[PDB]
Design a protein around this ligand. Structure first.
Ligand code: PLP
Ligand code: PLP
Ligand code: CL
Ligand code: CL
Ligand code: CL
Ligand code: CL
Ligand code: CL
Ligand code: CL
Ligand code: CL
Ligand code: CL
Ligand code: CL
Ligand code: CL
Ligand code: CL
Ligand code: CL
Ligand code: CL
Ligand code: CL
Ligand code: CL
Ligand code: CL
Ligand code: CL
Ligand code: CL
Ligand code: CL
Ligand code: CL
Ligand code: CL
Ligand code: CL
Ligand code: CL
Ligand code: NI
Lengths: 396, 396
């Protein structure tokens, strides 16, 4: 996780600034998804903790937090210290909790952000307690249980020693148990229901054996999938990430895509038949071709599988990427198109005209998952607020 | 390519700041590699243009440029406007040229950096000329020729129409041809020799047909491989990249690795045999295990592709990475180690004790050259400066 912009740095989101490639962030879609989830949960439903780790799933926590604050969302889940800093700087005053285990250095240097940590081992909890004591403060903690079987951040109560450790963790000075959680490893109802049943037993035992009061403890287990498909996993709070960005169960179409990936043509070059394109001469032109040179490569997070079948949108038509991906450049065959000029907009992910590069298309390649792609896209390219560009708006 | 730190932002490179993962950048190794190349080229050898695209190959152009300045390197090759900005801010006063085609917006907004552009088509050159004319200034340009057959940024003189366009490009008001270049698509001696032979013909034709004065033109073609293996491709100037970072032909051990990839243990959790690890339960523990939780995932540039061989270094020992990679966390089996605790340093790439994470291994696991990974490592994690002085003595 990188350094994020300082409070006074407002470069990101600006549309006029030159960018070799960029993410078009649809704030409206994000705000729609939040309200859509609210309506689903109702006014008596569980509280929402917007998960915005990895710089808001590549959408930019700096750009999205204001929407979360406006919606009165009480909780935000992040991963890095920088994400916590930005969240606070952008006006979030609710519960800020880390959704992963953190290093001692991270925990100690995150104190200024008044955030809450996640613990799943005695030694870790003891280290965090030591930090709290040395800084004469209190660190709220969520107890991660391995009820669902993720075996990542959670303590496993199937081990006798782990049960003893769990109870010991609760009594450490410097930290305060304010929540109990688990996490589902499989997006399948039967599997989730299995873990859910076990989590009810585990959380009940911890509350009882640990003598914790329910009014002081937030119980939460559900991610996007469980929130939508298994409402019995609501408990006190839900932890939706993907669905907030339109990247969850596709058939729930009410949740809209928030991000689009774009670039521009740098140059259109003319090459004779027989020529090869890119490193290692892997693609051979079967005819005199005009190739559009695009100023992004695998260092910009695009087509890191150097020889994968790929298409981009120009003039609302799908045109093929040819040759291996270079570090900073890719070539596209625009021989069938006419009037392609430098500066012409290209869509790598999203809609253009009546065409669209969909998550379904990009994931056609084995091993491809969009979540990985766009977090890296986001980290390696500037972001621009969609509605700021209104060349095609119709309000007067 | 993202926004880079502002001149007044000196967070990057600092060692004490909390980082979930980080790249250790050895300035001593970098300075050593520069001097080593100088000694190879000799006193009457070609000039060096340090290629520092992609934020200096993920090493941080903000951190390395000062070394380039002190070495007196006359030329720096970059890709993005931000890279050019940082280069100038860090004290570089030499030739600053872009090694890829750029968009009209990029070219126009790069004027303050007094850099030089790359052109391979008349239409793109006319656009750049229009920009220069509007700003009542001049834009130095390097003519990219497709002599070596990369078919990326260069104009192909085997086409009669391209030859005419090339001559027209030279006479455009607002731009001045100050260089002629090509680029080798294959790291093979014969292929390079074929390309440079054709480049000699093409460059000489352009000089003659264009009636250019040789004293104002820099001819350059060679990347790291060509520079080391094919001295016939020296010409006026060479464009070494990987070589400077210790990422070139392994046999040339005189060039030292500049970067290492590290993290720390966040928690060591106890899980019983039969348990599965990570999403989709892709790994099953076949024994009672202690797993080290590391606070980085694929959003931090770590392999997401399944692997039954991937490993990291802890206590100077290879330990296997188990389960599918999550967005922000990975798990490592430290069952065979004693006393692993939070804060313990982990090597993701580099050396630890007598152990090492080999580049060839990671390239196998990811299915791509290491640069595909470490440029992303750099964009998604903080840098911490290392100094190995030296390299040098003083005895005062
Ligand atoms: C990322 C994550 C989530 C959100 O998962 P989604 O599938 O995107 O909804 C929830 N809880 C934890 C602990 C996570 O790491
Ligand atoms: C990046 C690049 C180089 C440097 O390549 P290395 O293999 O890292 O030495 C040289 N020339 C051009 C045009 C490049 O784009
Ligand atoms: Cl709510
Ligand atoms: Cl809450
Ligand atoms: Cl978990
Ligand atoms: Cl007990
Ligand atoms: Cl299902
Ligand atoms: Cl249910
Ligand atoms: Cl479905
Ligand atoms: Cl992609
Ligand atoms: Cl269109
Ligand atoms: Cl408008
Ligand atoms: Cl507008
Ligand atoms: Cl920054
Ligand atoms: Cl030199
Ligand atoms: Cl200068
Ligand atoms: Cl502009
Ligand atoms: Cl000049
Ligand atoms: Cl080229
Ligand atoms: Cl000659
Ligand atoms: Cl030779
Ligand atoms: Cl890796
Ligand atoms: Cl060691
Ligand atoms: Cl191993
Ligand atoms: Cl022991
Ligand atoms: Ni408008």
């Amino acid at each position: 996780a990188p350094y994020l912009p300082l409070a006074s740095d407002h470069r990101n989101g600006e549309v006029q600034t030159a960018s070799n490639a960029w993410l078009e962030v649809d704030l409206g879609a994000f705000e729609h998804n939040i309200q859509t989830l609210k309506d689903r949960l109702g006014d008596k439903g569980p509280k929402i903790c917007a998960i915005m780790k990895a710089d808001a799933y590549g959408h930019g926590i700096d750009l999205l937090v204001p929407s979360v604050v406006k919606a009165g969302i009480p909780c935000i889940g992040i991963a890095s210290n920088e994400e916590a800093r930005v969240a606070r700087e952008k006006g979030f005053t609710g519960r800020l909790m880390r959704v992963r285990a953190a290093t001692p250095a991270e925990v100690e240097q995150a104190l200024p952000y008044k955030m809450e940590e996640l613990i799943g081992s005695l030694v870790s909890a003891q280290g965090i307690a030591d930090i709290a004591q040395r800084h004469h403060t209190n660190i709220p903690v969520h107890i991660a249980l391995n009820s669902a079987g993720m075996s990542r951040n959670g303590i496993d109560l199937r081990l006798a020693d782990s049960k003893e450790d769990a109870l010991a963790m609760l009594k450490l000075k410097g930290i305060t148990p304010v929540g109990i959680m688990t996490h589902f490893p499989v997006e399948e109802k039967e599997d989730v229901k299995m873990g859910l049943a076990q989590f009810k037993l585990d959380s009940q035992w911890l509350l009882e054996a640990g003598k914790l009061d329910r009014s002081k403890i937030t119980i939460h287990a559900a991610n996007s999938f469980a929130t939508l498909e298994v409402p019995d996993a609501y408990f006190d709070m839900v932890r939706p990430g993907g669905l907030l960005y339109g990247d969850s169960i596709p058939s729930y179409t009410e949740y809209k895509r928030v991000m689009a990936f774009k670039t521009q043509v740098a140059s259109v070059n003319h090459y004779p038949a027989g020529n090869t394109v890119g490193y290692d001469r892997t693609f051979t032109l079967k005819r005199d071709s005009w190739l559009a040179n695009l100023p992004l490569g695998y260092s910009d997070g695009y087509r890191r599988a150097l020889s994968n079948k790929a298409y981009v949108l120009i003039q609302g038509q799908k045109v093929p990427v040819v040759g291996k991906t270079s570090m900073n450049t890719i070539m596209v065959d625009v021989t069938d198109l006419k009037g392609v000029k430098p500066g012409d907009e290209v869509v790598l992910f999203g809609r253009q005209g009546e065409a669209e590069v969909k998550q379904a298309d990009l994931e056609e390649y084995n091993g491809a998952l969009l979540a990985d792609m766009y977090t890296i896209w986001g980290y390696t390219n500037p972001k621009k607020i969609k509605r700021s560009s209104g060349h095609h708006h119709h309000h007067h």
